């Protein structure tokens, strides 16, 4: 006859969701920079990032039902709001801006508006007449010259990101507390769903750079081995196609205009950093991509896409259908000011059976309302000097176009917009599990009386 016995500390886990804390690297700890956007009180990371591997283990992963991406999104939004709150409010900037075109010749396009306005000085009695150089996407004309006002002076309360902070995505390790572990799927071919052969346990993930971008996964992690096409519902076209590259595509984005910063005092203890006169040549921002590398990468992507849809088919690319400026184009921040490159010259090809660089126009937009938080918009201050950044495109957020009665040429257009996909590119191989160390089991043992 058998009897029950209790075992405490059994290798047993169950799917759950819990408040995951963080762990930052102590190398950038000397770069406090007066409370950098993300990492202020992030506990130091593990000096020995112990990552235990398991065998005879299979776990039903799901990158689309994962609750880590939701926690990451909410934490990023809350951290953004709490880093914005103590900065300077720009409520008096909502005034009639007498705007003219920048001092230039013909063949200008706007996109650089010299705007003068009556701004309040320190003393509430006296007033001040100051000028700035806004972008056309930041102002809108109200209807003698042409009078303008900021784009977010009727639907939101504009706030200026106090420039002491930065926007550099710092490696953030979402770590789980005691009684919880994180399961890493360290196999090569993993579409996102189903069982994972190589499931290892760890305290938490690698260094994640929370890059906020659309149509392009900049500074992201590369794919296990080859380009991987990940989508929730292959048949669904709306499902954002999450492509993971194996070779990072270099992209050099440069804001060439030499901007000077004017520190206008809007109030006692209230500052306002505006764009002074541009000293130098008036050019426009651009993002070079080596045409050969982008070509061969698109070739790899279409070769992999020819596996999920038919044996052989025609794959076509095109520039984005429509919507807001943040979706029709590729949005990202390079040196502290977010801007958008329309990337029409990046999705144009068509494949059926079988040295230079491409240049894309980039428009800047300082007044930002990312995450569609209606009623709270941000103002990005200018950056002195030329801006340059060399990023690595490691992913693509595409979307398939609708079919027809008969479809032999499926067309894919860039998209995204929802930043949950930017996190699903990193939190796809991870999942949190709670430990159930209590286990009843039968054996011949039996306690005495």
């Amino acid at each position: 006859n058998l009897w029950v016995t209790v075992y405490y500390g059994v290798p047993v886990w169950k799917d759950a969701e819990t408040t995951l804390f963080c762990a930052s690297d102590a190398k950038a700890y000397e770069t406090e920079k007066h409370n950098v956007w993300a990492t202020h009180a992030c506990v130091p990371t593990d000096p020995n990032p112990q990552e235990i591997h398991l065998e005879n283990v299979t776990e039903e992963f799901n990158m689309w039902k994962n609750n880590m991406v939701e926690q990451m999104h909410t934490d990023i939004i809350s951290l953004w709001d709490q880093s914005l709150k103590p900065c300077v409010k720009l409520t008096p900037l909502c005034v009639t801006l007498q705007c003219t075109n920048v001092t230039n010749n013909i063949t200008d396009d706007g996109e650089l508006k010299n705007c003068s306005f009556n701004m309040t000085t320190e003393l509430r009695d006296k007033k001040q007449k100051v000028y700035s150089l806004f972008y056309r996407l930041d102002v809108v004309q109200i209807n003698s010259n042409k009078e303008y006002r900021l784009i977010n002076c009727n639907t939101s309360a504009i706030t200026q990101a106090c420039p002491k902070v930065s926007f550099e995505p710092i490696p953030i390790h979402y770590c789980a507390p005691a009684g919880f572990a994180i399961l890493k799927c360290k196999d090569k071919k993993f579409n996102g769903t189903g069982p994972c052969p190589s499931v290892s346990t760890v305290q938490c993930t690698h260094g994640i750079k929370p890059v906020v971008s659309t149509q392009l996964l900049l500074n992201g992690s590369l794919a296990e081995e080859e380009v991987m096409i990940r989508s929730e519902n292959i048949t669904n076209n709306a499902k954002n196609i999450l492509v993971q590259f194996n070779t990072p595509v270099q992209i050099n984005c440069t804001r060439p205009n030499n901007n000077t910063r004017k520190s206008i005092r809007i109030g006692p203890g209230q500052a306002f950093y505006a764009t002074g006169d541009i000293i130098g040549d008036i050019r426009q921002a651009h993002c070079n991509v080596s045409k050969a590398t982008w070509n061969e990468t698109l070739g790899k992507v279409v070769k992999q896409l020819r596996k999920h849809f038919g044996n052989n088919t025609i794959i076509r690319f095109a520039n984005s259908s429509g919507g807001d400026l943040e979706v029709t184009t590729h949005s990202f921040n390079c040196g502290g000011e977010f801007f958008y490159c329309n990337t029409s010259g990046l999705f144009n090809s068509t494949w059926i059976s079988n040295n230079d660089s491409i240049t894309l126009p980039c428009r800047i937009k300082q007044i930002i309302n990312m995450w569609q938080r209606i009623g709270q918009a941000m103002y990005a201050p200018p950056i002195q000097g030329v801006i340059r950044c060399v990023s690595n495109i490691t992913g693509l957020i595409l979307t398939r176009d609708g079919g027809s009665t008969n479809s032999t040429t499926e067309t894919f257009r860039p998209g995204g917009g929802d930043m949950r996909d930017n996190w699903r590119s990193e939190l796809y191989k991870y999942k949190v599990v709670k430990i159930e160390p209590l286990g009843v089991a039968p054996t011949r043992c039996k306690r005495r009386v």
Partner: antibody, heavy 125, light 108 residues
Framework: VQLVQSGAQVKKPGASVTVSCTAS????????MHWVRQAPGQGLEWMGW????????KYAQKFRGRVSMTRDTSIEIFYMELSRLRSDDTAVYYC???????????????????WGQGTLVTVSS | SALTQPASVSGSPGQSITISCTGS?????????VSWYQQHPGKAPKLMIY???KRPSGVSNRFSASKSGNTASLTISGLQAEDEADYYC????????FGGGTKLTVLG
């Protein structure tokens, strides 16, 4: 919930018609919006769908290039612009609210629970 | 259209009728979301059968929906004079595809 549309329009062949559908009584940034076209006396035709969150639009193959769908989340109004109008475009247009949210529990297409009053555009030479 | 419906069906009040929505294997059979809308003459349609068989609110149990292979069917039990309107089929044909529409006539 209510979807109020504009009035009937009279456009010459080759013009551009801009119709507006205003929504009331729900969260504007959480429900897709289909644009349905129907010629008087014929079947039902689809044109595209709008996602108000960032306004991600996807048009039908028959009108890709002609139609442009946008939205103003401040006033909560969907706008549909149609260029290169032909005599076939004389029809009634409707704005259809999706039954569920597109972000949640939405892999496949389903639901047009709420519709608009329909705007009749008359295109004749 | 991508679907083929009867041009017009008829029935006696109180009886049951079946409207067939014939589609390919990639639109009606390949998925499970054939829906049925009720369009009155001159008015906006109304969703009366969402999903593939389930019904949204405001619609009584007089309507039902089934699917056999690639052929969907809408069954109406206890016909009434109010049902003398059009009823459109809808399917996800790698997109949005609707049935050709069928005019319903009862006691007339």
């Amino acid at each position: 919930v209510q979807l109020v549309q504009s009035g009937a329009q009279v456009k010459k062949p080759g013009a551009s018609v801009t119709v507006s559908c205003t929504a009331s009584g729900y969260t504007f940034t959480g429900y897709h919006m289909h644009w349905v076209r129907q010629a008087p006396g014929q079947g039902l035709e689809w044109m595209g769908w709008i996602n108000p969150f960032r306004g991600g639009v996807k048009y039908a193959q028959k009108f890709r290039g002609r139609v442009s769908m946008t939205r103003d989340t401040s006033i909560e109004i969907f706008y549909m612009e149609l260029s290169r109008l032909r005599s076939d475009d004389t029809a009634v247009y409707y704005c259809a609210r999706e039954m569920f949210d597109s972000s949640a529990d939405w892999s496949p297409w389903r639901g047009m629970v709420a519709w608009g009053q329909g705007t009749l555009v008359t295109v004749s030479s | 259209s991508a679907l083929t419906q009867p041009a017009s069906v008829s029935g006696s009040p109180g009886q049951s009728i079946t409207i067939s929505c014939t589609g390919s294997s990639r639109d009606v059979g390949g998925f499970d979301l054939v829906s049925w809308y009720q369009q009155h003459p001159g008015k906006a349609p109304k969703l009366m059968i969402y999903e593939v068989s389930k019904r949204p609110s405001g619609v009584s149990n007089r309507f039902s929906a089934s699917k056999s292979g690639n052929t969907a069917s809408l069954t109406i039990s206890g016909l009434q004079a109010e049902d003398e309107a059009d009823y459109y089929c809808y399917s996800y044909a790698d997109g949005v595809a609707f049935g050709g529409g069928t005019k319903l006539t009862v006691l007339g």
